[PDB]
Structures are given as structure tokens and as C-alpha cells.
Structure 1
Amino acid sequence: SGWQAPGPNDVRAPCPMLNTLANHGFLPHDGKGITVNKTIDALGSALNIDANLSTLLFGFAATTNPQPNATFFDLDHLSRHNILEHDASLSRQDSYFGPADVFNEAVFNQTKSFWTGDIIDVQMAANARIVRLLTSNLTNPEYSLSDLGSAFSIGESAAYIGILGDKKSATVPKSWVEYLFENERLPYELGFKRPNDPFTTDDLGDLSTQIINAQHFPQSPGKVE
């Protein structure tokens, strides 16, 4: 009850969380025809994300619809390389190697190795993201990261801490994050509960700044902020 894997005509994204919300039915289970109202309602219902942040994210999502000026998106639209989808994902391979939409065990094994305790803090999240950037740059001859892709990468690490975890301590249990990625199901059984405080654009901004502040390069190699 409450969760179903995708079937052959369902579409999924490179986003572990939208995929999770489609699997649960917060978003349409076939991943299609997502409007601004469905986004607001789904992200508010499942996660207590506020309307303004839901609206901002929807605005970006709509840009990936191949129809111009679209009022909806489908989850597979989000997989279009170098619009929102970017290299040096935590759990997906770069498009250069293979499809950048589905979970990739090799890549996620790398990310997990930088999550060094049972509680993920801002330092571990920043560290895991950095090694993905450097690893893609040195292994992918087509490696790219746009100013928008960089902002998204930083915000994705901020998101799993603040939306799945405790945005005030800026910590999240590692098992919860691993479960979300590996199952695209919410880790309710491991203790996750929908937060009572809405998650805002300013919350995401605050955690994003913390991520950048936890980066200690002697000299930044390329697009790291």
C-alpha cells in the first residue's frame, strides 16, 4: 500500500525525489502532465515544501518540455542533458558514459564513501559533491557544468539534508538518504516523518551557502561555486 514501482509506459527523471513522489502517487504515477498546481500540492503534501519554492522549481522544470512556453512537464523531460540535468551527479553517470536518468551503483558507491558517519552533516555532503565534480572533470572528456547546473548541484546536496533531515542542525541520517536513492521510496520505516515547518526558498539558500562555506580548496579547479 502506498508505493508502486514504475511500469513500462511510466516515465521517470534523474531526480531521486520526484521519482519517489511519482512512485508513491504524490505526483502522477506515470510521471506525465505535471502542472504548477500538481507540483505545489505534491511537494506540500509529501514534504511541506512551500508554494513559492514549488513554483520556482516548476518554472525550471517547464523549460525542459520540448514544447515552447509549456504549462506542464513529464519526468523524462528533466533528463534532457545540459538543461537542468548536469554532470557530476551523486547517483547518476554522466550522459557521456550512458543514460543519466537511472540510478548508477558505481557512482553512488563513490558518493557513499564520503558519507563517513551515521549522520550526514554539511561537511560530508560538500565533500561528496566535490569529489564527484573532480572525478567527472578527470574522466569525462565532454565534462561541462553551466552556471545553472552548478547552482542546481549545490542545491541538490542542500535539499537532501534540509528536506529529508533537520534543516536547523543541517544533518540527516545517512540510512535515510541511502534508502531514498536506492529505493526511490520515502524512508518512513527508518524514522523519516514529514516536517511540520515549511521548507522555503530561504532555507534552501541558507543550506546552499553552508555547502559552499564547507569547501576548502587551496585553489578551486573550475566550476565549484
Structure 2
Amino acid sequence: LPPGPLENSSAKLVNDEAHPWKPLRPGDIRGPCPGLNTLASHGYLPRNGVATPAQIINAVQEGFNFDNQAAIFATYAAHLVDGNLITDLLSIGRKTRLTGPDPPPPASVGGLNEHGTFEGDASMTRGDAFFGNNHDFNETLFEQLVDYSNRFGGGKYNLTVAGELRFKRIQDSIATNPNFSFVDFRFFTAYGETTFPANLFVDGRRDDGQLDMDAARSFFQFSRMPDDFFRAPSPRSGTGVEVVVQAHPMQPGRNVGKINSYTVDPTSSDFSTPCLMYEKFVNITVKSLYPNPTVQLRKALNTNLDFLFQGVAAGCTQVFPYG
């Protein structure tokens, strides 16, 4: 079952003796999410980068104080499109045999590195998949985050910096990635993720939304908590996303096979239709990976879809693609 919220959500030392940072061993998997990467590299998750949904939810709550609803939605969304529903295992990065025997095509079980399922374009510190690598830390892009932090954050990353950098990344992808896609689930996650460094990488004794560049580099590049790192003092995820959107409001869309051809998709959900984002994720994304599942895969799908729905905000109607 999905874990429930923390019994004690106060700030505390999370870079503690039981969770030391260690470097990667051969075969250890890290991916496009610096949160999950850091949790693996401190042993909140298995250090090889392969984990169950329940392990992921427990780790994001205990290590960073990610809120329960957000943890459940993100984890089950990722597992449904990128994980192995029979073995209950998800890679936090590249596709691996460690998640078990694969289901039939068209399901990919490609881990979090799979482009266009959860991962997508205009990431802050990772390049678009079209440019060859959607998962490793990118120094040029991080130096641009440092530059935007120096320009709009007084040297720190905050929500003002997030608003400017989010737009700059979208504009850069429009100008250079002929396959740029910015609709539905990615449209939502691309905005929320820009608040996470300000809300979750800032030491919880301060919780001031001002992330220093030493801490930023430690998390984004080395999957490493600063020495003496205290997690946030309460559960949260995307608080302040409205500031990022307000800086440069965008409509969902995509380049249409050429640079500078950004075309709005009226069938995409946006922030006016959050329930549509969930319904399309299940009815289109999940169903297309598993269009005619066998009995045991259907059961695992329905269970994980029920868990996903627990992370949906109230007032949406649950949808049942397999009955």
C-alpha cells in the first residue's frame, strides 16, 4: 500500500550517520531527478538506483519532506509508465534487467530515463533528449542556472530565478529542438520541478527559499546533501509554482518538426484543467503502453492506477481504462 504521511514532519538532520553519501559503484543507476539521485546516494533508497514505489515514497518523505499526495502521484505516475508492474520495481535512471522480465511491447519499462513518459524537455540542468542525453548533469546548463541566480536571485536560486530560467529553457528548446514537446504531464512537471530546489534543497532550519550555489551543485551534480543538511520543516512539493507561471505564462504545445514552429495544442491539459491531465495520463499514456494486458498485468495496472488516484487532488473523477 502507498505509505501515509510522516508521523513527525519536523526539520531534522537527514545527512546522518545511517545515511552517508557514497560514490557510485559499477552498475549503480542515477537518472534525471536530483531528488531521487540524492536519496539513492545517501541510502534512503537502494544505492543501485532500483526501488519499489513504496520505497520511493518513504524516501522522498523521510529525506526531503516531500508531501504525501505529491509523492504518491509522482511515484505511481512514474512507475506506471517506466517501471515493471509485475515485479514492483522502478529504475531511477536507465533501462535495466534488474527490474525483471519485461512485459510485451509496446510497454518500454525504460526507467526514469525514458523520454516522453515522465522525463521531458526544457529541464534546468539536463539537456533535451534530441541533443543526445536527457539524464546526466550538464555543466553549461548548470552555469546558466548560476548566471540566472546571480541576475535575479542575488546569487541564490529562488522563485524569481525559477520564473526566468523556466522561460529561458523553453525559449532555447523552441529555437534549437525541432522535436520540442511541452504538453500534458510534462507541461505540469516542468513548472513544479523549478520550485523544488527552493522548497526542498534549502536547509530546513532556514526554509527561506534562497538556495546557495554550493548546495545546488552538490545536489544537481553529485547527488549529495551538504554536510549537516536538515530537511524542510514541513511537508511540501510545489509551493510557489504560481510565481514561476506568472513570470512568463505559457500555453502547452510543441515544435512541429522544425525549430521556431511552436504550435499550441488545444487538446492538451493546462493549469485550468488539472483533472484532464490525470484522465489523459491514464486513458492515453498508460493505456497506449498496455493496450490489451493479460490478466496479471491488468490486475497490477488497476492496483497502481488506484494508488495514483490517491495522489490526485480532490474533485477529480477516477477513470477506469480496464474496468
Q: Which residue of 1 aligns with 2:79?
A: 62
Cα distance, 1:39 vs structure 2: 1.7
Give a deviation string over 1:134-179, Cα, whole Å, max 9, x none: 0111011222222211111101111111112279754333432232
Selected match of 2:216 from 177, 180, 189: 177
Count of aligned pairs between the two proteins? 216
Gaps of 5+ in 2: 1-16, 94-110, 254-261, 265-269, 272-323
What does residue 129 of structure 1 align with?
Answer: 166
User: Distance in 2 between the 1:222 and 1:176 partners?
Assistant: 37
- 1:83 equivalent in structure 2: 117
Question: Are the counterparts in 2 of residues 90 and 111 from structure 1 also a CA contact under 8 Å?
Answer: yes
Indicate whether 1:31 and 2:49 are aligned. yes
2:29 paired residue number: 11
Q: Distance in 1 between matches of 2:263 and 2:213?
A: 29
Mark the structure with the bigger radius of gyration: 2
Q: Letter of the aligned partner of 1:141 in structure 2? A: P
Using the aligned pairs only, state the percent identity.
26
Residue 94 of structure 1 corresponds to: 128
The residue aligned with 1:210 is: 243
Offset of residue 14 of structure 1:
0.6
Aligned to 2:147: 113
Paired with 1:69 and 1:115, the residues of 2 have a C-alpha distance of: 44
Q: 1:112 to 1:99 in 2, by over 3 A?
A: same
The structure-2 alpha-carbon separation of the partners of 1:169 and 1:211, relative to structure 1 and needing over 3 Å to count, comes to farther
Structure 1 length normalisation: TM-score?
A: 0.84
For 1:64 and 1:70, the matched residues in 2 are separated by: 14
| Corresponding letter in the other structure for 2:214 | S
Task: Tell me the amino acid that sits aligned with residue 221 of structure 2.
Answer: E
Equivalent of 1:21, from 27, 39, 47? 39
Seen in structure 2, the aligned counterparts of structure 1 residues 213 and 188 have a Cα distance that, compared at 3 Å, is farther
TM-score by length of 2: 0.60
**Partners of 2:166 and 2:244 within 8 A in 1:** no
Establish whether residue 196 from structure 1 lines up as the match of residue 233 from structure 2.
yes
Q: What's the C-alpha RMSD, in Å, of the aligned pairs?
A: 2.6
Shift of 1:216: 6.9
- CA distance in 1 between partners of 2:33 and 2:68 (Å): 19
The answer to whether the 8 A contact 1:79-1:101 is kept is yes
Q: Give the C-alpha shift of residue 44 in structure 1.
A: 1.8
1:64 aligns to what SS in structure 2? helix
Match of 2:225 in 1: 186
Q: What is the CA distance between 1:29 and its match in structure 2? A: 0.3
- Give the residue type in structure 1 aligned to 2:56: T
For 2:161 and 2:86, the matched residues in 1 are separated by 39
Judging by fraction of residues, say which structure has more helix.
Answer: 1
Would the aligned equivalents of 1:122 and 1:214 in 2 still touch at CA under 8 Å?
A: no
3-state DSSP of counterpart to 1:96 = helix
Q: Deviations over 1:61-82 (max 9, x none)?
A: 1123364577331112011011
Structure-1 residue corresponding to 2:311: none
**Does the CA-based 8 Å contact 2:125-2:142 persist in structure 1?**
yes
Does 2:81 match 1:44?
no
Unmatched tracts of structure 1, length 5 or more: none
Distance 1:84 1:216 in 2: 22
CA 1:6/1:131 → structure 2, altered by over 3 Å: closer, same or farther? same
